[PDB]
Symmetry: D2
Amino acid sequence: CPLMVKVLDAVRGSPAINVAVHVFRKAADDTWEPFASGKTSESGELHGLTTEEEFVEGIYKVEIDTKSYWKALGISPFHEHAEVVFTANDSGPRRYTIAALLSPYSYSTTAVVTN
Amino acid sequence: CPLMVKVLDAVRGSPAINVAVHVFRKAADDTWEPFASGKTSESGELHGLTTEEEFVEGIYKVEIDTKSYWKALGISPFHEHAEVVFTANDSGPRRYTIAALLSPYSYSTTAVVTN
Amino acid sequence: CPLMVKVLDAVRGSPAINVAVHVFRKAADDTWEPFASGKTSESGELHGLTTEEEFVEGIYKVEIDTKSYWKALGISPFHEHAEVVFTANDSGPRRYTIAALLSPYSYSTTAVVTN
Amino acid sequence: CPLMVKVLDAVRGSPAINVAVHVFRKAADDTWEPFASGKTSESGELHGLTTEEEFVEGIYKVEIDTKSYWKALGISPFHEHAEVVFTANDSGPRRYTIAALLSPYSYSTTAVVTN
Ligand SMILES: O=C(O)c1cc(I)cc(I)c1O
Ligand SMILES: O=C(O)c1cc(I)cc(I)c1O
């Protein structure tokens, strides 16, 4: 489990549940190729996206479908989605958590990268 | 104006207007003595809290009355207020902007300090 | 375990380890009485602060000693500490996670309150 | 100026100066067409990206080159950039401020939208 995505809701003070998340890897021609996807659980987490074998060094994009999340709650949002773009580097044994904290007109995102 | 407070609303995507702000300074006796107060304007900014003369070295607390803000809009938020505590002017006079970005169950705060 | 505190480091992209955390409850005379304290673990979490029996309705303050954290890393910080002040309400079965994401001149804090 | 970009540095407590910003607009063919670009000033602000005439309805992407910013300061950050994607001017012209608060492993972004 080298990659996990976590989403929190700053309006309700809760995990953001059933948020669609799409992960892409940058291809040689510079296009974004689908890599993994899922929906956050009751805990706002998405586990099992990839394996150590498949998660090679490269540039990844995590798209979080914030607009549909807010719409499902009957709340008017600003962004189309939240996008997190980063390079995975084999600087020893590392697990990546990409987290996002959501408001209708704002989001924060951080990386928690641990052994 | 050596001290300015700026407040934004992350739900509406707007300045946070009419937010009450109370500033305290730690006294010789180690208690929080009233220093200044005001409310944010239409721009979400609060200017004119103090002067270069009065804003001496000290430990300051800026209390931003976020609960009263959300309640005046008919919303029940999590926090009582947002308190920003910092040492000021310990290396001579600086200009401090204390900024806060508000959601019902979350806030962010930053400082912009200039010479 | 009705209360947990989590602290993350936005500079290193890691849990904030060995951060001192002090929790207070507001007393009848309006003073802050010590309630619980600890240091965050390797995961940046502080568990075991209180019990269901002791965590009655009231106003609580969570003080996170951010200044000492940054100093121990050799980094110059802005704030004395981060303070989170909130009312605990028995609106059915609820667990409170108070989380903070730290930078030298900024922090964010959110509440995750779940059944 | 209907579109402004503001960037702050959460490590230094300062405007983020000389940050490159590229704006794209989704074309009829569903690709990201170059729209405007510039760099933040000493105030951390980027004005004059566009005009009321040219800033028509559309889906816009504001790419803030955070990696280049941190690298120019001799720091190795997590993200490649911060991308802010939103529909603009769908209910007539508005003024948009897209703001970002940067740390090496984290960023926050908000919008301030006025009529
Ligand atoms: O706990 C988190 O995963 C978390 C994530 C973000 I992004 C911001 C805050 I405050 C948090 O507490
Ligand atoms: O524009 C601001 O003042 C601003 C203030 C905070 I606190 C966080 C973000 I993102 C901002 O953009």
